[PDB]
Design a protein around this ligand. Structure first.
Ligand SMILES: *[C@@H]1O[C@H](CO)[C@@H](O)[C@H](O)[C@H]1NC(C)=O
Ligand SMILES: *[C@@H]1O[C@H](CO)[C@@H](O)[C@H](O)[C@H]1NC(C)=O
Ligand SMILES: *[C@@H]1O[C@H](CO)[C@@H](O)[C@H](O)[C@H]1NC(C)=O
Ligand SMILES: *[C@@H]1O[C@H](CO)[C@@H](O)[C@H](O)[C@H]1NC(C)=O
Ligand SMILES: *[C@@H]1O[C@H](CO)[C@@H](O)[C@H](O)[C@H]1NC(C)=O
Ligand SMILES: *[B]([O])([O])[C][C][C]([N][C][C][N])C([O])=O
Ligand SMILES: [Cl-]
Ligand SMILES: [Cl-]
Lengths: 187, 342
């Protein structure tokens, strides 16, 4: 999965998220076209096993049908119709939690767009029943959860990849996630 | 070398080179959509494990002139021949021909360009074609991807052909060259989106997918339509409005998380002390849980009626109901958040 944000000079914007699902997808690459294919079928629910989430009938496979996605490409706009944020995330199933944390860190905690993107992240999706935190999270946060009876566990790598652009009085502030190693461009 | 605060335009992608391509597309007078598509093509090359023309996508777009947002839907569909019981394991739903849904990416690009494009079609492909033939050094992200899937890559010759050096996965800094995709991209630039779905490339796709055990046919490709959604999902956040896609994506869930949390009125002070920071972060996780509880009711809104479910999920009171069930000093059993299935 990959996300990117964009702001044009005329003030228009695009938040885009794209995926082949899992790393390298289905692991089928055409020897002719070089096209590497999605394992998006994995994202439907089966009447069989758990990954986790019990069989959920509203997401069962049907012909012609779109699997439920974790992706949420977002654009925030002022009342005055001027664009204020273009954000989203990618990476496993932590897309929706990271996106929210990015919005929260900027909109409410007052963090600059780079801090918003670099700040440690946490994740809980109910099923399965665990709170996950990034390795360099504030440990007072860890303790506060562990004493309100959250059973935490540290992530081996990192939680999600976030690309954001925020509007400021000084212009457009942008950040790509160092976890995946991108950098933005502009003028 | 750069502040990353820009006077007029910005592009944030997960690879510097794709960010530049994006920006250079704006400089040459392209719209946001032009820059977007142009950059995604770069990203399907430079982060080939993440996304690409073998996938699908969603685009949220704001038009500063019309003062309006829209969503373009280009996520992959199940083949005509697919059925509810076609898998019996994870292994089966994640590898080989059968785990492949009908790719959408290209119809996506076409519709977005057909509506907001200012540059020619082929212009968007041009710099990515160059990058594919010449090759580029492997970046951090794709390096770890490679490392993570070393075994499955090295044991499969068709992947290793492009992804190994001496039958070992490429490392960061080493040159990746994508000769077959470059031709492909060039055919797309010349012949257009038709080439993929009902065109010079179609039969080869079918054969490739079926040869590995999938069930995708020409008819699937021929029929795939991207979809314009005129009225995206929105939520009010103080002074502002947030746009996002409804089901089948996670707009509804993100709407609920934020609608729950906006009631605590978080500020700078929410994190100024460990006492308050702990509570804040606890509330965040509880809201996640409450929102994920309701997720399990969601699907393709062409197949399952989720009209009222979504209106609820994004409802102001529904959000207020769940906030009142959050205890400041404890988490709860799964049952507590009433996860539903009908
Ligand atoms: C799974 O089992 C069902 C029912 O027997 C059948 O439709 C299908 O052939 C099986 N699929 C796989 C991938 O094993
Ligand atoms: C906004 O919509 C108009 C049609 O009303 C379209 O021509 C134009 O491409 C859109 N604006 C941008 C910047 O793409
Ligand atoms: C938010 O959601 C619905 C979609 O039609 C509607 O009530 C309202 O117009 C939307 N808001 C905006 C700003 O489009
Ligand atoms: C809408 O919310 C109410 C509670 O406020 C609840 O009774 C109902 O289950 C919800 N509707 C649907 C279709 O889930
Ligand atoms: C889930 O996690 C919490 C610990 O954070 C615990 O209270 C609860 O009993 C666990 N199990 C279930 C089934 O909810
Ligand atoms: B992306 O690599 O983060 C994958 C997102 C995709 N499926 C995630 C569940 N494995 C989606 O939901 O679109
Ligand atoms: Cl990304
Ligand atoms: Cl290739």
């Amino acid at each position: 999965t990959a996300h990117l944000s964009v702001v044009a000079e005329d003030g228009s914007a695009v938040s885009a998220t794209s995926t082949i699902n899992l790393y390298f997808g289905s692991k089928v690459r055409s020897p002719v076209s070089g096209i590497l294919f999605n394992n998006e079928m994995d994202d439907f629910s089966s009447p069989s096993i758990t990954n986790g989430v019990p069989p959920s009938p509203a997401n069962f496979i049907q012909p012609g049908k779109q699997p439920l996605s974790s992706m949420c490409p977002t654009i925030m706009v002022g009342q005055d119709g001027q664009v204020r944020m273009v954000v989203g995330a990618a990476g496993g199933t932590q897309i929706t939690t990271a996106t929210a944390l990015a919005i929260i860190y900027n909109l409410w905690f007052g963090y600059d767009v780079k801090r918003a993107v670099e700040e440690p992240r946490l994740h809980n999706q109910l099923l399965p029943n665990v709170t996950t935190v990034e390795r360099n999270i504030d440990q007072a946060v860890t303790a506060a959860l562990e004493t309100r009876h959250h059973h935490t566990q540290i992530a081996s790598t990192f939680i999600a990849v976030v690309q954001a652009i925020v509007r400021t009085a000084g212009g457009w502030a942008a950040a790509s996630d160092s976890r995946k190693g991108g950098e933005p461009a502009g003028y | 070398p750069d502040n990353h605060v820009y006077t007029r335009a910005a592009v944030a992608a997960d690879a510097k080179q794709c960010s530049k391509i994006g920006r250079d597309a704006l400089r040459d007078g392209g719209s946001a959509v032009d820059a977007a598509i142009a950059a995604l093509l770069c990203v399907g090359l430079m982060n080939a494990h993440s996304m690409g023309i073998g996938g699908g996508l969603f685009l949220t777009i704001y038009n500063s002139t019309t003062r309006k947002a829209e969503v373009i839907n280009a996520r992959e569909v199940a083949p005509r021949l697919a059925f509810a019981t076609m898998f019996n394991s994870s292994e089966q739903s994640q590898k080989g021909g059968l785990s492949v849904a009908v790719p959408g990416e290209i119809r996506g690009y076409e519709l977005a360009h057909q509506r907001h494009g200012r540059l020619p079609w082929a212009r968007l492909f041009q710099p990515s074609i160059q990058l594919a033939r010449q090759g580029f050094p492997v970046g951090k992200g794709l390096a770890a991807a490679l490392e993570n899937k070393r075994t499955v890559i090295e044991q499969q010759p068709v992947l290793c052909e492009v992804f190994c050096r001496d039958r070992k996965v490429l490392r960061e800094g080493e040159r990746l060259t994508l000769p077959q995709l470059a031709d492909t991209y060039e055919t797309l630039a010349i012949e257009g989106a038709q080439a993929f779905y009902n065109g010079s490339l179609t039969a080869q796709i079918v054969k490739d997918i079926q040869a590995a055990g999938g069930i995708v046919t020409a008819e699937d490709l021929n029929n795939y339509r991207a979809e314009l959604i005129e009225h995206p999902l929105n939520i009010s956040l103080g002074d502002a409005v947030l746009y996002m896609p409804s089901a089948p994506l996670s707009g509804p869930v993100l709407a609920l998380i934020l609608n729950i949390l906006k009631g605590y009125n978080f500020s700078r002070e929410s994190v100024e002390s460990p006492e308050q920071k702990g509570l804040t972060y606890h509330r965040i996780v509880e809201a996640f849980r409450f929102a994920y509880a309701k997720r399990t009711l969601l699907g393709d809104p062409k197949f399952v009626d989720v009209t009222e479910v979504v209106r609820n999920m994004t409802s102001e009171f529904f959000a207020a109901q769940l906030r009142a069930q959050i205890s400041d000093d404890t988490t709860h059993p799964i049952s507590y958040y009433k996860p539903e299935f009908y």
